């Protein structure tokens, strides 16, 4: 029961990889300490392999089977359809890794018959054969961080023809089943506004609130063949076409349970018997499996009135406190149960009696005040990683714009409004690229977004209070400040000053550009405008957003 076995062949890059922050004319206006920012490369893949390779033991008790029976009972109420070749093709990102069989993501989106002819044959092969392990490519992720140095994460994904077949069999299931099985506990149904509402409401619905986040060590690595067969048995409870049942059975045996790892050069690196990071079912399976283990571990622990919020491997529990030592006892039991279930912790959990101190989906609840003085709650984070990545994206064009995703999801935050919006609107102005659509990743799915729709997207995700927030908390204001001192970012009076400029230049241009200046930078002037609902905002089609997670699922909406 080893997560992985290795041949000794190295995980190879396909293009050269920069580990050091690229510098341009713009870099120093955002960040001075360039030595603090790095990107992970293949060079560290060996250390990741070490970290993720271990023996899993799993001990499964009545709590585990009682929760699973309940989950399957809900799964039975789900009906899911097959997607046609065309539908699945249209879900393929333009930028998506090309097929080994001589065709690419754009050929797939075009419905070019060489692509579609292959896909039909991969599909046919899935129905006929249910035993033959499907090839995966193993690559090192290039992601940017601040030093404190992390090894590259491993992405494992099958060929583009298989990925389109996964969509035909399972897109509708992984879109619809998780909300039916987990109800309000399924995190990816929530906009950031909806998520802060659920957390705060959940917290207040307790007499004596206690909550903790649960950090599983390398959760993909802790997922067993058992866990992956249990997931397929949940999928199989749905009312499915028999062609769909056959495909899900085949993809489970041949791809999801495990299979061989090939590097960029086409050499054999070893064998996987855990979760693939890069398949359609990674989000949904992690979320189901985390919810099953954690739900059963709650019952073991005798946590009273448990509310859970689960996003893939990211887990928050809020429950009734039974005093501090009782709570501390509960959490150790909780941890023993998760360990037996093969989800041992990274940091051991800590009970918390202040909601603002709980981190879940890399975010904490904080509080500011809107126009009318009224307290509004919002999600924020330490902005160290988002700014490190903004620095890197200032000097290199990346196909996913972390800064755009971070503006959309953290729009109400001091740091997103003062730094990210100021910095990136100045760049789009100087290049006159306000009207040029950018790809960004929300809950793993890729979206093409026009920056000039940002005010409308922000009203819909967060409400109009996102444009009027002030009197951020002492503790939020400190963490922003300490991060700027760390990264050598200019102070927030410099950003206010810059934003007055950007605001002025955006109003200059009228149309949506003016709206952007009105709404995004109202905070920068003291003689404030009165901000009121945007007309084009309820025209925006935000169905597809906050339905489901698709991390590593190759999904474009
Ligand atoms: C755009 C980014 C900033 C990356 C966003 C996101 O898409 C994921 C996420 N994407 S994922 O599908 O890869 C995944 C898996 C597990 C946990 C989170 C995520 C994430 O954690 N994010 C930070 C986040 C999440 C929920 C929130 F309400 C708020 C706020 N306010 C902020």
Alpha helices, DSSP H, located in 434-473: 454-462
- The CB density around residue 281, as the number of other CB atoms within 10 Å, is 27
Distance between CA atoms of residues 22 and 396, nearest Å: 7
User: Rounded to whole angstroms, what are the CA distances from 347 to 213, 216, 344, 491?
Assistant: 10, 8, 10, 33
Residue 377 β-bridge partners? 367
Scored b (16 or more CB within 10 A) or e, 407-432 reads: bbbbbbbbbbbbbbbbbbbbbbbeee
Task: Out of 308, 330, 361, pick the residue that ends a domain.
Answer: 361
Same domain, yes or no: 413 and 526: yes
The full length of the chain comes to 557
* Residues 181, 75 contacting (CB under 8 angstroms): yes
SS in 3 state form for 335-363?
A: HHHHHHCCCCECCCCCCECCHHHCCECCE
Same domain, yes or no: 325 and 417: no
368 Cα: distance to centroid of ligand 1 (angstroms): 21
Same domain, yes or no: 140 and 87: no
Start-to-end Cα distance in the chain:
38
Scored b (16 or more CB within 10 A) or e, 75-88 reads: beebebebbebeeb
The secondary structure of residue 449, as a DSSP letter, is E
Same domain, yes or no: 354 and 237: no
Task: Enumerate residues lining ligand 1, CB below 6 A.
Answer: 192, 195, 283, 311-312, 314, 361-363, 379, 405-406, 409-410, 442-444, 549, 551
Same domain, yes or no: 108 and 232: yes
* Residues 271, 261 contacting (CB under 8 angstroms): yes
| Side-chain-facing half-sphere of 243: CA atoms under 13 Å | 12
* Residues 212, 316 contacting (CB under 8 angstroms): yes
Same domain, yes or no: 233 and 347: no
Same domain, yes or no: 523 and 416: yes
Same domain, yes or no: 418 and 484: yes
The 3-state DSSP composition of the chain as helix, strand, coil percent (nearest 5) reads 50, 15, 35
Q: Is there a binding annotation on residue 314?
A: yes
Q: Is there a binding annotation on residue 305?
A: no
Distance between CA atoms of residues 476 and 415, nearest Å: 9
Task: Out of 319, 336, 361, pick the residue that ends a domain.
Answer: 361
The residue numbers preceding gaps of C to N over 2.5 A in the chain are 148
User: Rounded to whole angstroms, what are the CA distances from 114 to 169, 449, 460, 523?
Assistant: 21, 30, 41, 54
Q: Residue 375: in which H helix or E strand, if any?
A: strand 375-380
| Side-chain-facing half-sphere of 270: CA atoms under 13 Å | 18
- CA dihedral (222, 224, 226, 228) positive or negative: positive
Same domain, yes or no: 382 and 489: yes
Same domain, yes or no: 233 and 311: no
The secondary structure of residue 530, as a DSSP letter, is P
139 Cα: distance to centroid of ligand 1 (angstroms): 22
* Residues 223, 275 contacting (CB under 8 angstroms): yes
443 Cα: distance to centroid of ligand 1 (angstroms): 5
Q: Is there a binding annotation on residue 215?
A: yes
The secondary structure of residue 264, as a DSSP letter, is T
Resolution in angstroms, to 1 decimal, for this deposition? Answer: 2.0
The secondary structure of residue 154, as a DSSP letter, is E
Residue 253 β-bridge partners? none
Distance between CA atoms of residues 181 and 203, nearest Å: 22
553 Cα: distance to centroid of ligand 1 (angstroms): 15
Task: Out of 249, 273, 297, pick the residue that ends a domain.
Answer: 273
Rounded to the nearest 5°, which phi and psi values hold at 117? -60, -45
Q: Is 69 exposed, middle or buried (0-12, 13-18, 19+ CB in 10 A)?
A: exposed
549 Cα: distance to centroid of ligand 1 (angstroms): 9
Q: Residue 211: in which H helix or E strand, if any?
A: strand 209-214
Same domain, yes or no: 381 and 442: yes
User: Rounded to whole angstroms, what are the CA distances from 68 to 23, 338, 455?
Assistant: 52, 15, 43
Mutate to test the pocket of ligand 1, among 193, 360, 361, 380 (most ligand atoms within 8 A of CB): 361
Query: Domain span at residue 69?
Result: 56-132+159-182+224-257+274-280
The secondary structure of residue 214, as a DSSP letter, is E
Residue closest via CA to ligand 1's atom 28 equals 192
Q: Which of 453, 363, 467 is nearest to 411 (CA)?
A: 467
Residue closest via CA to ligand 1's atom 14 equals 443
Q: Which of 253, 317, 256, 251 is nearest to 285 (CA)?
A: 256
Cα 93 → chain centroid: 17
Residue closest via CA to ligand 1's atom 26 equals 361
Task: Answer left, alpha or beta for residue 313, where phi above 0 means left and psi between -120 and 50 means alpha.
Answer: alpha
Distance between CA atoms of residues 234 and 354, nearest Å: 36
Rounded to the nearest 5°, which phi and psi values hold at 145? -140, 175
Parallel, antiparallel, or unpaired: how do β-strands 136-140 and 259-262 relate?
A: parallel
Cα-based angle 480, 484, 487 (whole degrees, multiple of 5)? 135
Same domain, yes or no: 235 and 106: yes
Into how many domains does the chain fold?
4
Distance between CA atoms of residues 286 and 278, nearest Å: 12
* Residues 217, 345 contacting (CB under 8 angstroms): yes
Distance between CA atoms of residues 95 and 105, nearest Å: 7
């Amino acid at each position: 029961h080893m997560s992985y076995t290795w041949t000794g062949a190295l995980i190879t890059p396909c293009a050269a990889e920069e580990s050091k922050l690229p510098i341009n004319a713009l870099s120093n206006s955002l960040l001075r300490h360039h030595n603090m920012v790095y990107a992970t490369t293949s060079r560290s893949a060996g250390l990741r392999q070490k970290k993720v390779t271990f023996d899993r033991l799993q001990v499964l008790d009545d709590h585990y089977r009682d929760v699973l029976k309940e989950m399957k009972a809900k799964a039975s109420t789900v009906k899911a359809k097959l997607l046609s070749v065309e539908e699945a093709c249209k879900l393929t990102p333009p930028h998506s890794a090309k097929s080994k069989f001589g065709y690419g993501a754009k050929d797939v989106r075009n419905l070019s018959s060489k692509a579609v002819n292959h896909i039909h044959s991969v599909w046919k092969d899935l129905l006929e054969d249910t035993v033959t392990p499907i090839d995966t490519t193993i690559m090192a992720k290039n992601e940017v961080f601040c030093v404190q140095r992390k090894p590259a994460r491993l992405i494992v994904f099958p060929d583009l023809g298989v990925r389109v077949c996964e969509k035909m069999a399972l897109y509708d299931v992984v879109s619809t089943l998780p909300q039916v099985v987990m109800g309000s506990s399924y995190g990816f149904q929530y906009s950031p506004g909806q998520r802060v509402e659920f957390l705060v409401n959940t917290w207040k619905s307790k007499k004596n609130p206690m909550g903790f986040s649960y950090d599983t060590r390398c959760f993909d690595s802790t997922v067993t063949e058992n866990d992956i067969r249990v997931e397929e048995s949940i999928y199989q409870c749905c009312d499915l076409a028999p062609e769909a049942r056959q495909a899900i059975k085949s993809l489970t045996e041949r791809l999801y349970i495990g299979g061989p790892l090939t590097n960029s050069k086409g050499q054999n690196c070893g064998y996987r018997r855990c979760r693939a990071s890069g398949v359609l079912t990674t989000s949904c399976g992690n979320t189901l499996t985390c919810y099953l283990k954690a739900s059963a571990a709650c019952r073991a622990a005798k946590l009273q009135d448990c509310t859970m919020l689960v996003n893939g491997d990211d887990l928050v529990v809020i429950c009734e406190s039974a005093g501090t030592q009782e709570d501390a006892a509960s959490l150790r039991v909780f941890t023993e149960a998760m360990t037996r279930y093969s989800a041992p912790p990274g940091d051991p959990p800590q009970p918390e009696y202040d909601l603002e101190l709980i981190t879940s989906c890399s975010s904490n609840v904080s509080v500011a005040h809107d126009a009318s003085g009224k307290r509004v709650y919002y999600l924020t984070r330490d902005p160290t990683t988002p700014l490190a990545r903004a620095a890197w994206e200032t000097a290199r064009h990346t196909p996913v714009n972390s800064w755009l995703g971070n503006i959309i999801m953290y729009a109400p935050t001091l740091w997103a409004r003062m730094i990210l919006m100021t910095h990136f609107f100045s760049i789009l102005l100087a290049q006159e690229q306000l009207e040029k659509a950018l790809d960004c990743q929300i809950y793993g799915a890729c979206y093409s977004i026009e920056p000039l729709d940002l005010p409308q997207i922000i009203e819909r995700l967060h409400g109009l209070s996102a444009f009027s927030l002030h009197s951020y908390s002492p503790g939020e204001i400190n963490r922003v400040a300490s991060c700027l001192r760390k990264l050598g970012v200019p102070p927030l009076r410099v950003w206010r000053h810059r934003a007055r400029s950007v605001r002025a230049r955006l109003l200059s241009q009228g149309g949506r550009a003016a709206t952007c200046g009105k709404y995004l930078f109202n905070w920068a002037v003291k003689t404030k405008l009165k901000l009121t609902p945007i007309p084009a905002a309820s025209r925006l089609d935000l169905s597809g957003w906050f339905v489901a997670g698709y991390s590593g699922g190759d999904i474009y909406h």
